[PDB]
mmCIF file of all heavy atoms in Angstrom:
data_model
loop_
_atom_site.group_PDB
_atom_site.id
_atom_site.type_symbol
_atom_site.label_atom_id
_atom_site.label_comp_id
_atom_site.label_asym_id
_atom_site.label_seq_id
_atom_site.Cartn_x
_atom_site.Cartn_y
_atom_site.Cartn_z
ATOM 1 N N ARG A 369 -40.051 48.788 6.304
ATOM 2 C CA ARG A 369 -39.033 48.108 5.479
ATOM 3 C C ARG A 369 -38.370 49.135 4.560
ATOM 4 O O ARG A 369 -37.136 49.188 4.370
ATOM 5 C CB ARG A 369 -39.669 47.037 4.514
ATOM 6 C CG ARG A 369 -38.593 46.411 3.648
ATOM 7 C CD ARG A 369 -39.021 45.233 2.677
ATOM 8 N NE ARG A 369 -38.110 45.025 1.697
ATOM 9 C CZ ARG A 369 -38.191 44.228 0.666
ATOM 10 N NH1 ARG A 369 -39.270 43.561 0.477
ATOM 11 N NH2 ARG A 369 -37.235 44.149 -0.248
ATOM 12 N N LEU A 370 -39.138 50.178 3.973
ATOM 13 C CA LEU A 370 -38.534 51.272 3.175
ATOM 14 C C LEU A 370 -37.525 51.907 4.039
ATOM 15 O O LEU A 370 -36.477 52.223 3.498
ATOM 16 C CB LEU A 370 -39.658 52.175 2.693
ATOM 17 C CG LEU A 370 -39.257 53.335 1.747
ATOM 18 C CD1 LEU A 370 -38.509 52.869 0.559
ATOM 19 C CD2 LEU A 370 -40.461 54.253 1.453
ATOM 20 N N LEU A 371 -37.743 52.282 5.375
ATOM 21 C CA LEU A 371 -36.777 52.952 6.106
ATOM 22 C C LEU A 371 -35.515 52.144 6.294
ATOM 23 O O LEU A 371 -34.386 52.702 6.045
ATOM 24 C CB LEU A 371 -37.369 53.428 7.505
ATOM 25 C CG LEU A 371 -36.371 54.057 8.520
ATOM 26 C CD1 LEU A 371 -35.791 55.284 7.942
ATOM 27 C CD2 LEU A 371 -37.199 54.423 9.770
ATOM 28 N N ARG A 372 -35.591 50.853 6.582
ATOM 29 C CA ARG A 372 -34.577 49.981 6.715
ATOM 30 C C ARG A 372 -33.655 49.824 5.432
ATOM 31 O O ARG A 372 -32.460 49.842 5.397
ATOM 32 C CB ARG A 372 -34.949 48.451 7.173
ATOM 33 C CG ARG A 372 -35.522 48.411 8.591
ATOM 34 C CD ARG A 372 -35.644 47.060 9.151
ATOM 35 N NE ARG A 372 -36.259 46.114 8.254
ATOM 36 C CZ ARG A 372 -37.630 45.908 8.138
ATOM 37 N NH1 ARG A 372 -38.400 46.661 8.902
ATOM 38 N NH2 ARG A 372 -38.204 45.047 7.329
ATOM 39 N N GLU A 373 -34.545 49.793 4.252
ATOM 40 C CA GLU A 373 -33.733 49.813 2.882
ATOM 41 C C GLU A 373 -32.835 51.138 2.783
ATOM 42 O O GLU A 373 -31.756 51.014 2.404
ATOM 43 C CB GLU A 373 -34.765 49.806 1.743
ATOM 44 C CG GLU A 373 -35.643 48.591 1.720
ATOM 45 C CD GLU A 373 -34.964 47.360 1.175
ATOM 46 O OE1 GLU A 373 -33.944 47.512 0.419
ATOM 47 O OE2 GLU A 373 -35.482 46.162 1.256
ATOM 48 N N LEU A 374 -33.452 52.185 3.080
ATOM 49 C CA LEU A 374 -32.754 53.494 2.902
ATOM 50 C C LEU A 374 -31.570 53.574 3.942
ATOM 51 O O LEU A 374 -30.470 54.034 3.442
ATOM 52 C CB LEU A 374 -33.810 54.717 3.247
ATOM 53 C CG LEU A 374 -34.864 54.811 2.146
ATOM 54 C CD1 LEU A 374 -35.812 55.882 2.576
ATOM 55 C CD2 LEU A 374 -34.319 54.979 0.709
ATOM 56 N N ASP A 375 -31.685 53.075 5.131
ATOM 57 C CA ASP A 375 -30.590 53.010 6.118
ATOM 58 C C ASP A 375 -29.471 52.288 5.483
ATOM 59 O O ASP A 375 -28.296 52.724 5.636
ATOM 60 C CB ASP A 375 -31.114 52.400 7.487
ATOM 61 C CG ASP A 375 -31.854 53.307 8.398
ATOM 62 O OD1 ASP A 375 -31.902 54.453 8.108
ATOM 63 O OD2 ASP A 375 -32.421 52.797 9.353
ATOM 64 N N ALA A 376 -29.750 51.073 4.796
ATOM 65 C CA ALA A 376 -28.620 50.298 4.148
ATOM 66 C C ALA A 376 -28.036 51.089 3.070
ATOM 67 O O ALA A 376 -26.734 51.025 2.979
ATOM 68 C CB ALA A 376 -29.247 49.015 3.665
ATOM 69 N N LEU A 377 -28.807 51.839 2.278
ATOM 70 C CA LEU A 377 -28.206 52.573 1.234
ATOM 71 C C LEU A 377 -27.350 53.798 1.886
ATOM 72 O O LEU A 377 -26.239 53.955 1.400
ATOM 73 C CB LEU A 377 -29.230 53.221 0.299
ATOM 74 C CG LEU A 377 -30.042 52.196 -0.594
ATOM 75 C CD1 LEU A 377 -31.088 52.833 -1.405
ATOM 76 C CD2 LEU A 377 -29.126 51.265 -1.403
ATOM 77 N N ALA A 378 -27.799 54.328 2.955
ATOM 78 C CA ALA A 378 -27.033 55.364 3.684
ATOM 79 C C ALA A 378 -25.711 54.897 4.176
ATOM 80 O O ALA A 378 -24.731 55.620 4.128
ATOM 81 C CB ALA A 378 -27.929 55.938 4.839
ATOM 82 N N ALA A 379 -25.700 53.663 4.736
ATOM 83 C CA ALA A 379 -24.371 52.981 5.146
ATOM 84 C C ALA A 379 -23.448 52.778 4.038
ATOM 85 O O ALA A 379 -22.321 52.997 4.265
ATOM 86 C CB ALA A 379 -24.736 51.715 5.899
ATOM 87 N N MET A 380 -23.943 52.305 2.878
ATOM 88 C CA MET A 380 -23.058 52.204 1.688
ATOM 89 C C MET A 380 -22.541 53.533 1.363
ATOM 90 O O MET A 380 -21.298 53.563 1.137
ATOM 91 C CB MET A 380 -23.831 51.764 0.492
ATOM 92 C CG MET A 380 -24.157 50.216 0.452
ATOM 93 S SD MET A 380 -25.365 49.820 -0.809
ATOM 94 C CE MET A 380 -24.436 50.080 -2.087
ATOM 95 N N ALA A 381 -23.289 54.602 1.293
ATOM 96 C CA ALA A 381 -22.920 55.929 1.018
ATOM 97 C C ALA A 381 -21.831 56.477 1.940
ATOM 98 O O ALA A 381 -20.930 57.188 1.596
ATOM 99 C CB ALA A 381 -24.156 56.793 0.992
ATOM 100 N N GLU A 382 -22.007 56.050 3.294
ATOM 101 C CA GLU A 382 -21.090 56.437 4.423
ATOM 102 C C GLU A 382 -19.662 55.794 4.203
ATOM 103 O O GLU A 382 -18.658 56.504 4.555
ATOM 104 C CB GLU A 382 -21.618 55.972 5.758
ATOM 105 C CG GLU A 382 -22.359 57.129 6.505
ATOM 106 C CD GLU A 382 -22.054 57.143 8.012
ATOM 107 O OE1 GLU A 382 -20.880 57.319 8.426
ATOM 108 O OE2 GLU A 382 -22.979 56.888 8.799
ATOM 109 N N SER A 383 -19.547 54.612 3.679
ATOM 110 C CA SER A 383 -18.299 53.961 3.435
ATOM 111 C C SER A 383 -17.708 54.274 2.080
ATOM 112 O O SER A 383 -16.579 53.850 1.826
ATOM 113 C CB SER A 383 -18.419 52.445 3.722
ATOM 114 O OG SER A 383 -19.116 51.764 2.755
ATOM 115 N N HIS A 384 -18.507 54.907 1.149
ATOM 116 C CA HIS A 384 -17.988 55.118 -0.203
ATOM 117 C C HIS A 384 -17.131 56.486 -0.191
ATOM 118 O O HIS A 384 -17.630 57.459 0.395
ATOM 119 C CB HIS A 384 -19.071 55.252 -1.226
ATOM 120 C CG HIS A 384 -18.643 55.079 -2.665
ATOM 121 N ND1 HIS A 384 -18.790 53.852 -3.254
ATOM 122 C CD2 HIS A 384 -18.112 55.963 -3.502
ATOM 123 C CE1 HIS A 384 -18.233 54.027 -4.462
ATOM 124 N NE2 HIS A 384 -17.826 55.249 -4.699
ATOM 125 N N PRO A 385 -15.997 56.568 -0.888
ATOM 126 C CA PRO A 385 -15.269 57.785 -0.874
ATOM 127 C C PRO A 385 -15.883 59.009 -1.525
ATOM 128 O O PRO A 385 -15.777 60.128 -1.132
ATOM 129 C CB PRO A 385 -13.937 57.481 -1.639
ATOM 130 C CG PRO A 385 -14.266 56.310 -2.468
ATOM 131 C CD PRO A 385 -15.193 55.485 -1.625
ATOM 132 N N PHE A 386 -16.828 58.692 -2.540
ATOM 133 C CA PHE A 386 -17.672 59.730 -3.214
ATOM 134 C C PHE A 386 -19.032 59.927 -2.591
ATOM 135 O O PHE A 386 -19.764 60.795 -3.070
ATOM 136 C CB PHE A 386 -17.691 59.441 -4.734
ATOM 137 C CG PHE A 386 -16.373 59.644 -5.375
ATOM 138 C CD1 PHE A 386 -15.436 58.550 -5.540
ATOM 139 C CD2 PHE A 386 -15.938 60.917 -5.805
ATOM 140 C CE1 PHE A 386 -14.183 58.688 -6.104
ATOM 141 C CE2 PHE A 386 -14.695 61.113 -6.355
ATOM 142 C CZ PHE A 386 -13.813 60.038 -6.618
ATOM 143 N N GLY A 387 -19.247 59.381 -1.489
ATOM 144 C CA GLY A 387 -20.598 59.416 -0.750
ATOM 145 C C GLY A 387 -21.873 58.933 -1.445
ATOM 146 O O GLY A 387 -22.881 59.320 -1.124
ATOM 147 N N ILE A 388 -21.618 58.035 -2.510
ATOM 148 C CA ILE A 388 -22.740 57.501 -3.315
ATOM 149 C C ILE A 388 -23.160 56.175 -2.753
ATOM 150 O O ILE A 388 -22.369 55.396 -2.230
ATOM 151 C CB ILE A 388 -22.437 57.492 -4.823
ATOM 152 C CG1 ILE A 388 -21.068 56.753 -5.082
ATOM 153 C CG2 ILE A 388 -22.338 58.944 -5.368
ATOM 154 C CD1 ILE A 388 -20.842 56.192 -6.418
ATOM 155 N N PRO A 389 -24.473 55.742 -2.700
ATOM 156 C CA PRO A 389 -24.893 54.500 -2.156
ATOM 157 C C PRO A 389 -24.558 53.299 -3.143
ATOM 158 O O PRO A 389 -25.442 52.725 -3.722
ATOM 159 C CB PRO A 389 -26.373 54.656 -1.952
ATOM 160 C CG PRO A 389 -26.843 55.670 -2.950
ATOM 161 C CD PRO A 389 -25.673 56.521 -3.292
ATOM 162 N N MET A 390 -23.222 53.026 -3.382
ATOM 163 C CA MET A 390 -22.725 51.999 -4.205
ATOM 164 C C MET A 390 -21.676 51.187 -3.582
ATOM 165 O O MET A 390 -20.987 51.690 -2.670
ATOM 166 C CB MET A 390 -22.228 52.621 -5.521
ATOM 167 C CG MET A 390 -23.248 53.267 -6.447
ATOM 168 S SD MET A 390 -24.491 52.269 -7.218
ATOM 169 C CE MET A 390 -23.726 51.828 -8.786
ATOM 170 N N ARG A 391 -21.558 49.939 -3.983
ATOM 171 C CA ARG A 391 -20.478 48.985 -3.561
ATOM 172 C C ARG A 391 -19.845 48.550 -4.820
ATOM 173 O O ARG A 391 -20.602 48.675 -5.981
ATOM 174 C CB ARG A 391 -21.034 47.719 -2.907
ATOM 175 C CG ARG A 391 -21.785 48.007 -1.609
ATOM 176 C CD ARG A 391 -22.742 46.849 -1.271
ATOM 177 N NE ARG A 391 -23.692 46.725 -2.416
ATOM 178 C CZ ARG A 391 -24.747 45.893 -2.371
ATOM 179 N NH1 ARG A 391 -24.909 45.089 -1.267
ATOM 180 N NH2 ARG A 391 -25.514 45.735 -3.390
ATOM 181 N N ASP A 392 -18.632 48.029 -4.966
ATOM 182 C CA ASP A 392 -17.946 47.531 -6.179
ATOM 183 C C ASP A 392 -18.819 46.599 -7.042
ATOM 184 O O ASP A 392 -18.963 46.739 -8.186
ATOM 185 C CB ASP A 392 -16.623 46.876 -5.876
ATOM 186 C CG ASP A 392 -15.378 47.753 -5.630
ATOM 187 O OD1 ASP A 392 -15.550 48.967 -5.746
ATOM 188 O OD2 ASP A 392 -14.314 47.265 -5.241
ATOM 189 N N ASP A 393 -19.581 45.706 -6.300
ATOM 190 C CA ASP A 393 -20.471 44.779 -7.032
ATOM 191 C C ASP A 393 -21.738 45.358 -7.730
ATOM 192 O O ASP A 393 -22.313 44.780 -8.565
ATOM 193 C CB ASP A 393 -20.917 43.544 -6.110
ATOM 194 C CG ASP A 393 -21.519 43.970 -4.782
ATOM 195 O OD1 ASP A 393 -22.002 45.033 -4.655
ATOM 196 O OD2 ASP A 393 -21.675 43.021 -3.892
ATOM 197 N N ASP A 394 -21.935 46.618 -7.397
ATOM 198 C CA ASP A 394 -23.093 47.391 -8.036
ATOM 199 C C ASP A 394 -22.785 48.033 -9.308
ATOM 200 O O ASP A 394 -23.566 48.588 -9.995
ATOM 201 C CB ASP A 394 -23.656 48.519 -7.035
ATOM 202 C CG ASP A 394 -24.281 47.951 -5.773
ATOM 203 O OD1 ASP A 394 -25.264 47.092 -5.895
ATOM 204 O OD2 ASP A 394 -23.975 48.404 -4.678
ATOM 205 N N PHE A 395 -21.438 47.934 -9.700
ATOM 206 C CA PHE A 395 -20.990 48.550 -10.938
ATOM 207 C C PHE A 395 -21.038 47.558 -12.083
ATOM 208 O O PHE A 395 -20.117 47.039 -12.585
ATOM 209 C CB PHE A 395 -19.635 49.195 -10.799
ATOM 210 C CG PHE A 395 -19.660 50.434 -10.008
ATOM 211 C CD1 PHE A 395 -19.327 50.405 -8.585
ATOM 212 C CD2 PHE A 395 -20.031 51.687 -10.552
ATOM 213 C CE1 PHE A 395 -19.464 51.533 -7.811
ATOM 214 C CE2 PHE A 395 -20.135 52.803 -9.745
ATOM 215 C CZ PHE A 395 -19.897 52.753 -8.417
ATOM 216 N N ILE A 396 -22.343 47.367 -12.472
ATOM 217 C CA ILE A 396 -22.804 46.428 -13.570
ATOM 218 C C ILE A 396 -23.302 47.288 -14.752
ATOM 219 O O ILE A 396 -23.214 48.544 -14.735
ATOM 220 C CB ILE A 396 -24.051 45.556 -13.002
ATOM 221 C CG1 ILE A 396 -25.200 46.567 -12.478
ATOM 222 C CG2 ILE A 396 -23.573 44.643 -11.852
ATOM 223 C CD1 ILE A 396 -26.565 45.905 -12.132
ATOM 224 N N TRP A 397 -23.843 46.615 -15.796
ATOM 225 C CA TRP A 397 -24.436 47.269 -17.000
ATOM 226 C C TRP A 397 -25.498 48.302 -16.472
ATOM 227 O O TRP A 397 -26.363 47.907 -15.711
ATOM 228 C CB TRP A 397 -25.079 46.148 -17.903
ATOM 229 C CG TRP A 397 -25.229 46.598 -19.289
ATOM 230 C CD1 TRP A 397 -25.803 47.818 -19.737
ATOM 231 C CD2 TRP A 397 -25.048 45.784 -20.434
ATOM 232 N NE1 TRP A 397 -25.927 47.848 -21.123
ATOM 233 C CE2 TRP A 397 -25.507 46.599 -21.623
ATOM 234 C CE3 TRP A 397 -24.538 44.615 -20.659
ATOM 235 C CZ2 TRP A 397 -25.407 46.148 -22.903
ATOM 236 C CZ3 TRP A 397 -24.430 44.109 -21.965
ATOM 237 C CH2 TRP A 397 -24.827 44.853 -23.090
ATOM 238 N N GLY A 398 -25.260 49.570 -16.796
ATOM 239 C CA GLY A 398 -26.301 50.594 -16.434
ATOM 240 C C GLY A 398 -26.123 51.019 -15.022
ATOM 241 O O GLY A 398 -27.122 51.198 -14.311
ATOM 242 N N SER A 399 -24.814 50.999 -14.480
ATOM 243 C CA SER A 399 -24.462 51.323 -13.066
ATOM 244 C C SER A 399 -24.902 52.801 -12.761
ATOM 245 O O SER A 399 -25.290 53.074 -11.599
ATOM 246 C CB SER A 399 -22.972 51.217 -12.882
ATOM 247 O OG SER A 399 -22.272 52.041 -13.713
ATOM 248 N N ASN A 400 -24.908 53.704 -13.667
ATOM 249 C CA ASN A 400 -25.428 55.060 -13.560
ATOM 250 C C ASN A 400 -26.869 55.054 -13.227
ATOM 251 O O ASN A 400 -27.235 55.826 -12.373
ATOM 252 C CB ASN A 400 -25.134 55.939 -14.703
ATOM 253 C CG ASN A 400 -23.567 56.353 -14.871
ATOM 254 O OD1 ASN A 400 -23.091 56.730 -15.856
ATOM 255 N ND2 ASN A 400 -22.946 56.163 -13.841
ATOM 256 N N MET A 401 -27.648 54.136 -13.793
ATOM 257 C CA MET A 401 -29.105 54.013 -13.518
ATOM 258 C C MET A 401 -29.161 53.311 -12.106
ATOM 259 O O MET A 401 -30.080 53.764 -11.310
ATOM 260 C CB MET A 401 -29.838 53.208 -14.574
ATOM 261 C CG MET A 401 -31.301 52.997 -14.289
ATOM 262 S SD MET A 401 -32.073 51.468 -14.862
ATOM 263 C CE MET A 401 -31.114 50.260 -13.934
ATOM 264 N N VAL A 402 -28.389 52.384 -11.793
ATOM 265 C CA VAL A 402 -28.317 51.743 -10.460
ATOM 266 C C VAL A 402 -28.260 52.824 -9.415
ATOM 267 O O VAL A 402 -29.096 53.007 -8.502
ATOM 268 C CB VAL A 402 -27.208 50.622 -10.164
ATOM 269 C CG1 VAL A 402 -27.352 50.145 -8.734
ATOM 270 C CG2 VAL A 402 -27.494 49.462 -11.165
ATOM 271 N N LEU A 403 -27.204 53.758 -9.580
ATOM 272 C CA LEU A 403 -26.946 54.856 -8.690
ATOM 273 C C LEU A 403 -28.122 55.861 -8.596
ATOM 274 O O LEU A 403 -28.550 56.286 -7.455
ATOM 275 C CB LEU A 403 -25.729 55.623 -9.136
ATOM 276 C CG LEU A 403 -25.452 57.076 -8.616
ATOM 277 C CD1 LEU A 403 -25.212 56.984 -6.961
ATOM 278 C CD2 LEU A 403 -24.169 57.698 -9.136
ATOM 279 N N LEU A 404 -28.613 56.303 -9.813
ATOM 280 C CA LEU A 404 -29.727 57.227 -9.824
ATOM 281 C C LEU A 404 -31.049 56.789 -9.226
ATOM 282 O O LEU A 404 -31.727 57.644 -8.623
ATOM 283 C CB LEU A 404 -29.915 57.842 -11.262
ATOM 284 C CG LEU A 404 -28.673 58.689 -11.737
ATOM 285 C CD1 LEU A 404 -28.762 58.738 -13.340
ATOM 286 C CD2 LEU A 404 -28.739 60.067 -11.110
ATOM 287 N N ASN A 405 -31.343 55.465 -9.460
ATOM 288 C CA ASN A 405 -32.572 54.898 -8.799
ATOM 289 C C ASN A 405 -32.443 54.889 -7.399
ATOM 290 O O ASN A 405 -33.523 55.060 -6.707
ATOM 291 C CB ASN A 405 -32.802 53.433 -9.403
ATOM 292 C CG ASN A 405 -33.324 53.244 -10.793
ATOM 293 O OD1 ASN A 405 -33.668 54.211 -11.413
ATOM 294 N ND2 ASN A 405 -33.199 52.033 -11.224
ATOM 295 N N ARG A 406 -31.279 54.755 -6.801
ATOM 296 C CA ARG A 406 -31.120 54.720 -5.365
ATOM 297 C C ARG A 406 -31.218 56.159 -4.839
ATOM 298 O O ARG A 406 -31.924 56.284 -3.829
ATOM 299 C CB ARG A 406 -29.717 54.091 -5.018
ATOM 300 C CG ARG A 406 -29.779 52.538 -5.270
ATOM 301 C CD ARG A 406 -28.410 51.965 -5.054
ATOM 302 N NE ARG A 406 -28.484 50.535 -5.331
ATOM 303 C CZ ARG A 406 -27.458 49.751 -5.121
ATOM 304 N NH1 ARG A 406 -26.255 50.179 -4.631
ATOM 305 N NH2 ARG A 406 -27.558 48.382 -5.316
#
Side-chain angles (χ1 to χ4, degrees):
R369 180 179 165 187
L370 182 58
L371 176 56
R372 291 197 308 279
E373 296 281 340
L374 295 178
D375 282 350
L377 296 178
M380 279 171 69
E382 262 220 64
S383 78
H384 199 96
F386 293 92
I388 56 158
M390 293 295 267
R391 296 157 303 186
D392 281 354
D393 57 13
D394 292 309
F395 290 94
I396 57 166
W397 199 312
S399 59
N400 287 160
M401 181 210 65
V402 179
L403 168 64
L404 291 160
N405 289 344
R406 291 168 179 190

